[PDB]
Enzyme design. Structure first.
Site, PDB file in Angstrom:
ATOM      1  N   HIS C  59      11.224  85.994  62.941  1.00 34.68           N
ATOM      2  CA  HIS C  59      10.923  85.920  64.371  1.00 34.68           C
ATOM      3  C   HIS C  59      11.488  87.109  65.143  1.00 34.68           C
ATOM      4  O   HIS C  59      11.080  87.375  66.276  1.00 34.68           O
ATOM      5  CB  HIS C  59      11.378  84.588  64.980  1.00 34.68           C
ATOM      6  CG  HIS C  59      12.864  84.397  64.999  1.00 34.68           C
ATOM      7  ND1 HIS C  59      13.564  83.899  63.920  1.00 34.68           N
ATOM      8  CD2 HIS C  59      13.779  84.616  65.971  1.00 34.68           C
ATOM      9  CE1 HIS C  59      14.848  83.831  64.223  1.00 34.68           C
ATOM     10  NE2 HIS C  59      15.006  84.260  65.464  1.00 34.68           N
ATOM     11  N   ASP C  89      11.796  81.729  57.419  1.00 40.15           N
ATOM     12  CA  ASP C  89      12.042  82.589  58.571  1.00 40.15           C
ATOM     13  C   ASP C  89      12.817  83.840  58.161  1.00 40.15           C
ATOM     14  O   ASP C  89      13.676  84.322  58.899  1.00 40.15           O
ATOM     15  CB  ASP C  89      12.798  81.831  59.666  1.00 40.15           C
ATOM     16  CG  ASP C  89      12.925  82.632  60.952  1.00 40.15           C
ATOM     17  OD1 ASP C  89      12.157  83.598  61.138  1.00 40.15           O
ATOM     18  OD2 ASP C  89      13.796  82.292  61.781  1.00 40.15           O
ATOM     19  N   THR C 147      10.619  67.872  59.426  1.00 40.53           N
ATOM     20  CA  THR C 147       9.549  68.270  58.519  1.00 40.53           C
ATOM     21  C   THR C 147       9.818  69.653  57.929  1.00 40.53           C
ATOM     22  O   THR C 147      10.455  70.492  58.566  1.00 40.53           O
ATOM     23  CB  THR C 147       8.187  68.282  59.240  1.00 40.53           C
ATOM     24  OG1 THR C 147       7.985  67.030  59.907  1.00 40.53           O
ATOM     25  CG2 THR C 147       7.055  68.516  58.251  1.00 40.53           C
ATOM     26  N   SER C 164      20.605  86.534  65.501  1.00 33.96           N
ATOM     27  CA  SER C 164      19.580  86.220  64.452  1.00 33.96           C
ATOM     28  C   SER C 164      19.404  87.333  63.457  1.00 33.96           C
ATOM     29  O   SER C 164      19.219  88.493  63.824  1.00 33.96           O
ATOM     30  CB  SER C 164      18.226  85.930  65.094  1.00 33.96           C
ATOM     31  OG  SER C 164      18.277  84.701  65.814  1.00 33.96           O
ATOM     32  N   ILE C 224      -0.865  68.076  50.214  1.00 35.38           N
ATOM     33  CA  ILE C 224      -0.752  66.676  50.572  1.00 35.38           C
ATOM     34  C   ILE C 224       0.406  66.481  51.531  1.00 35.38           C
ATOM     35  O   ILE C 224       1.334  67.296  51.595  1.00 35.38           O
ATOM     36  CB  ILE C 224      -0.613  65.751  49.333  1.00 35.38           C
ATOM     37  CG1 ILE C 224       0.709  66.003  48.605  1.00 35.38           C
ATOM     38  CG2 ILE C 224      -1.813  65.899  48.410  1.00 35.38           C
ATOM     39  CD1 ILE C 224       1.861  65.204  49.165  1.00 35.38           C
ATOM     40  N   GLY C 225       0.342  65.394  52.283  1.00 35.63           N
ATOM     41  CA  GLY C 225       1.400  65.055  53.207  1.00 35.63           C
ATOM     42  C   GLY C 225       1.792  63.609  53.022  1.00 35.63           C
ATOM     43  O   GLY C 225       0.934  62.737  52.900  1.00 35.63           O
ATOM     44  N   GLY C 226       3.092  63.349  52.997  1.00 33.42           N
ATOM     45  CA  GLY C 226       3.576  61.999  52.784  1.00 33.42           C
ATOM     46  C   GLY C 226       5.054  61.856  53.070  1.00 33.42           C
ATOM     47  O   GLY C 226       5.788  62.844  53.122  1.00 33.42           O
ATOM     48  N   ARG C 227       5.492  60.617  53.259  1.00 30.30           N
ATOM     49  CA  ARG C 227       6.890  60.331  53.546  1.00 30.30           C
ATOM     50  C   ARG C 227       7.509  59.544  52.397  1.00 30.30           C
ATOM     51  O   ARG C 227       7.010  58.482  52.026  1.00 30.30           O
ATOM     52  CB  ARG C 227       7.011  59.550  54.855  1.00 30.30           C
ATOM     53  CG  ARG C 227       8.432  59.175  55.236  1.00 30.30           C
ATOM     54  CD  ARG C 227       8.436  58.211  56.407  1.00 30.30           C
ATOM     55  NE  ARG C 227       9.710  57.510  56.535  1.00 30.30           N
ATOM     56  CZ  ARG C 227       9.877  56.385  57.224  1.00 30.30           C
ATOM     57  NH1 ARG C 227       8.847  55.827  57.848  1.00 30.30           N
ATOM     58  NH2 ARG C 227      11.072  55.814  57.285  1.00 30.30           N
ATOM     59  N   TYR C 300       0.025  78.758  47.833  1.00 28.51           N
ATOM     60  CA  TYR C 300       0.201  78.199  49.164  1.00 28.51           C
ATOM     61  C   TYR C 300      -0.541  79.038  50.195  1.00 28.51           C
ATOM     62  O   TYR C 300      -0.417  80.263  50.210  1.00 28.51           O
ATOM     63  CB  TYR C 300       1.688  78.123  49.516  1.00 28.51           C
ATOM     64  CG  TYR C 300       2.005  77.165  50.643  1.00 28.51           C
ATOM     65  CD1 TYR C 300       2.628  75.949  50.392  1.00 28.51           C
ATOM     66  CD2 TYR C 300       1.679  77.476  51.957  1.00 28.51           C
ATOM     67  CE1 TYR C 300       2.919  75.070  51.419  1.00 28.51           C
ATOM     68  CE2 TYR C 300       1.965  76.602  52.989  1.00 28.51           C
ATOM     69  CZ  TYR C 300       2.585  75.402  52.716  1.00 28.51           C
ATOM     70  OH  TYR C 300       2.872  74.531  53.742  1.00 28.51           O
TER      71      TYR C 300
END
EC number: 3.4.21.107
Lengths: 303, 4, 303, 303, 4, 4
Positions: C59, C89, C147, C164, C224-227, C300
């Site tokens: 950033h 980052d 997340t 930073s 995929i997304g999941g908890r 990715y």
């Protein structure tokens, strides 16, 4: 699982230095007051020597109808304003020396190093004497204001309102500086953390010695303004040295007084040292010509 | 910027 | 009452590490600028090795028309953006290696411990190189955002804008991490104090090594997304792995790739390690049935 | 240039004390909740002894439909509210003692000194157990509120919401106090830095011992109000001791109970010690006359 | 909540 | 100011 152990502590530095750090109260009359003293502002102070001379910030004692100095041992004094200096934001106070006065440990041979543990001692929000711990984050810092830069120790020892004029010390109790300012610049509206400045002790001393000798601090004045090879003259400098020499703006000053002038800061310092009324050579390059003008220094105009 |  | 004594100091750590910490300037053109470079944002950087590879935050260098690296010894360079990674980052810069470059002390065998004294080194508000002292408050912290959690050292060493990309080090000068983020969450509108995060040094290294090898960081993607026994599939995951496997949402994945899957975090890490294009088994319990679907991993998607 | 060296660390203090510091969750039903528990407020707690008695702040557990205690080792308990005290802002909790419970190191012979390094251990903003480092800035501080003053250790160890009820310890791991409050007073609208208070450990202990013995803390009550030789009676004190004695406001109380009364604070403490229902002499100077009135103490009215 |  |  049992302790004959010794807790890591800076109590020694505290016991050596804290007693010499005082609570300074600036009391003033109000149209509101109707003849009743009220605290305008408050801060701290350091007892420099047993004669009862105390260092503090100028902005702490400005426009005081009365100045009260409170020692940690309970003793309370009314103090005499020996003198003050806007440039360094320093001021010296004097109090009754009968009996014994505690003094802040000073070691002129000591060189403050970046990374040195330091304690800030003062009276934030008038809660009483507070000790905060940090390190020396930097040296020779100009401060918040670039112009008229002064050397500042920077520290992340927590500094709050009330700490002004108080002491910064190392783990040995030795005076490192006089806590003066903290950084508040919005920069997107957030709150700056762990950034505060102190006048270095060496400078504090020199200034105190000059305020005791004379009611003020005496400097040489050339009356010019410019930004940083050679230096450019921008400021009008009307009257005084500028008129006496009839200096021409827009010219660059190569050298002055048997010394080089690469940076204006090193030059401005030199100008201040010289006594008022003295006349020395000034070397400028105008139209690529090495012109020389005689000029009389004068005491810096009061602020 | 510097005056002296 | 006199001192041959030695002040408690972290100057050694400062002298070992500070020179390797640089001032990073992100300069960009403005419609306002009219062809004049202006500082968009500024921060710090760490010189990792003598080849002139520098770590910093992404950033800090985003959308830079020019990137300037300033060393504490005065040297100024223009830097090449080797690569960056939104996920961590992090970003790597390259500069002229002629002569000698200072490097940040690294000790890969060192284990950062909670309670270790650490110094933060950086350029807050562009005042110059500032050293603040704190401890390691915690390890393995997710950060402000739950997340896509990443391991963070948490420190109460004062961190401000400008810090930073700079370094966090221990008393020995060894690199502990790269100061990245500070906590500002309102939580009733007050200001959070002494809470800042650093990318652990081990991760920094691995990521730097991957950005030098390739222009980017290469990870496996399942989409995929999941908890968080077993894990549930929520995300649509349209196309790619989800289509190739024809995965059915609302199912629970017991295990994958000869390894158990109790927590999605340990699983997501594993998925990233695997090279793009590879195909491995996925075990899910749908309707209490141990169904198995073959699926092809892919690199990715860029951020 | 290579290190077999040992990093300055407070890890030992951390390893000794942290396990005993717990996450306290105050859960309450909402009209919104519709039968679902939500976290009203959260904080920390200290396990005082292996019976499973835990110290925390009262304001953390006020109006709780359920109180949850989470240990760092993973264990979760529901806790019984043994008792609370508004005056000290303390509360005691009880949990299942089966197996082994970690306890906070206590050393009753230890004298907290100004300048002692201390760690604050707690759960700020529910990020998880956070360790911050500071020193003891002061002792015997009244706090933010002058009236009903209580002894407070003042520390510049960073304290945030979530830290309440947690522990302050020295480098040896010994309990110094219970982090309770931080200073937020506007004073021109800026943010106070590094100023937080802890109930001293000695007081914590005494109060815990009294809450375990009885559901509450039992004090003697005179029902009078006054400001600081002798003390002046201002408060109406209607009923109870004031009526029983028929005390006359505007009078000065020289001495009471075979002891001198120079300061009301030393006197108010004494009054609290005495058991409820007892009757002792009160010496006041009314009209320059040494009048004496018999009066019955009573248990301090619940808050 | 976690995507990978 | 102090009540007790």
């Amino acid at each position: 699982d049992s302790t004959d152990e010794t807790p890591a502590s800076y109590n020694l530095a505290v016991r050596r230095a804290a007693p010499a750090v005082v609570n300074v109260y600036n009391r003033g009359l109000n149209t509101n007051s109707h003849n009743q003293l009220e605290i305008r502002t408050l801060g701290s102070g350091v007892i420099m020597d047993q004669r009862g001379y105390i260092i503090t910030n100028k902005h702490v004692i400005n426009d005081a109808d009365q100045i009260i100095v409170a020692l940690q041992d309970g003793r309370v004094f009314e103090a005499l304003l020996v003198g003050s200096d806007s440039l360094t934001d320093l001021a010296v106070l004097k109090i009754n020396a009968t009996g014994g006065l505690p003094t802040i440990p000073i070691n002129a041979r000591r060189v403050p190093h970046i990374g040195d543990v330091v304690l800030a001692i003062g009276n934030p929000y008038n809660l009483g004497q507070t000790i905060t711990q940090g390190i020396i984050s930097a040296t020779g810092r100009i401060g918040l204001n670039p112009t008229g830069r002064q050397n500042f120790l920077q520290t992340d020892a927590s500094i709050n309102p009330g700490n002004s004029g108080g002491a910064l010390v190392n783990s040995l109790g030795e005076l490192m500086g006089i806590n003066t300012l903290s950084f508040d610049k919005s920069n997107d509206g957030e709150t700056p953390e762990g950034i505060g400045f102190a006048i270095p002790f060496q400078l504090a001393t020199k200034i105190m010695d000059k305020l005791i000798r004379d009611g003020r601090v005496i400097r040489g004045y050339i009356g010019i303004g410019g930004r940083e090879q050679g230096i450019v003259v921008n400021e009008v400098s009307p009257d005084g040295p500028a008129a006496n020499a009839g200096i021409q703006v827009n010219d660059l000053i190569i050298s002055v007084d048997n010394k080089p002038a690469i940076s204006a800061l090193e030059t401005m310092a030199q100008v201040a040292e010289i006594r008022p009324g003295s006349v020395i050579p000034v070397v400028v390059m105008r139209d690529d010509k090495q012109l020389t003008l005689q000029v009389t220094i004068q005491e810096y105009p009061a602020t | 910027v510097y005056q002296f």
